[PDB]
Amino acid sequence: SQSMIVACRKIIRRSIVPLELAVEIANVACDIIRAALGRQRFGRLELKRISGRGFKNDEEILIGNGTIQKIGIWDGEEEFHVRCGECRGILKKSKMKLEKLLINSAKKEDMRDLIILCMVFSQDTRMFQGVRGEINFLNRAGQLLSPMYQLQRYFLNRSNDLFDQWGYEESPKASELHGINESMNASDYTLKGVVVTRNVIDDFITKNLSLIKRTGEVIMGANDV
Numbered sequence: 001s002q003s004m005i006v007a008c009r010k011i012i013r014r015s016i017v018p019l020e021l022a023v024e025i026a027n028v029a030c031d032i033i034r035a036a037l038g039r040q041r042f043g044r045l046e047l048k049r050i051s052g053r054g055f056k057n058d059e060e061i062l063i064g065n066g067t068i069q070k071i072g073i074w075d076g077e078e079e080f081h082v083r084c085g086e087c088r089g090i091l092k093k094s095k096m097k098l099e100k101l102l103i104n105s106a107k108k109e110d111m112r113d114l115i116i117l118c119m120v121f122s123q124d125t126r127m128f129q130g131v132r133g134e135i136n137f138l139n140r141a142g143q144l145l146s147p148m149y150q151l152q153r154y155f156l157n158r159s160n161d162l163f164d165q166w167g168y169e170e171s172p173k174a175s176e177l178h179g180i181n182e183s184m185n186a187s188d189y190t191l192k193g194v195v196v197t198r199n200v201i202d203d204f205i206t207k208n209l210s211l212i213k214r215t216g217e218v219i220m221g222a223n224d225v
């Protein structure tokens with residue numbers, strides 16, 4: 001597990017600077033190696049469809065730093081079973097709106113990453129408004145990240161600006177539920193739309209190393225490793 005995952009990433013890092021290089025050196029990361037020889041991802045966030053359907057339309061989005069960005073905005077009432085590390089949850093969202101995120105308790109790194117990744121994934125208006133600094137990042141291979149991966153990187157590193165822009169509400173009163181604050185502790189207020197439940201939520205190729213479905217929609221790639 002430890003030696004395997006590290007070995008998978010090291011092959012992909014050198015191959016991108018690409019599919020033909022990765023197969024020769026061989027002969028999230030390990031799933032790309034298996035697909036080359038013979039679940040939707042957004043960084044560490046793993047998603048699986050529960051309900052609804054999404055459709056992507058390009059829009060010019062004003063974001064909080066004053067720039068206008070061309071972003072593939074998804075439309076439709078949707079629900080996803082989500083996971084980041086050991087943290088499990090259910091995400092309900094619509095066009096540029098996180099409507100509800102029900103999660104289980106986990107180590108704080110995973111709870112925080114799940115919440116941030118879901119806020120970014122939702123394309124919520126408040127998340128776009130929370131950008132302050134520069135978001136043009138070039139990745140390890142010298143490639144400019146797409147707008148959605150720029151926001152992921154930005155907010156994973158600067159989470160405090162997001163949460164204060166996101167806002168808070170009174171925590172739910174149901175016995176199995178509690179709220180979660182900005183420090184990822186149980187709280188009588190909660191990040192808007194987010195709740196923690198004590199009830200265990202159940203468990204679940206392109207030349208540039210991007211895995212594709214039969215329809216066309218890509219499920220994971222190099223940016224997710």
Ligand SMILES: O=C(O)[C@H]1[C@H]2CC[C@H](CC2)[C@@H]1Nc1nc(-c2n[nH]c3ncc(F)cc23)ncc1F
Nearest residue numbers: 041042054072074078121122123148217218219
């Ligand atoms: O939209 C994209 O360009 C890609 C990028 C790489 C993974 C994700 C997120 C970024 C996305 N791919 C896909 N996204 C979705 C999707 N459905 N509903 C959504 N709401 C927000 C969102 F953000 C993505 C989606 N459905 C099928 C996909 F195949």
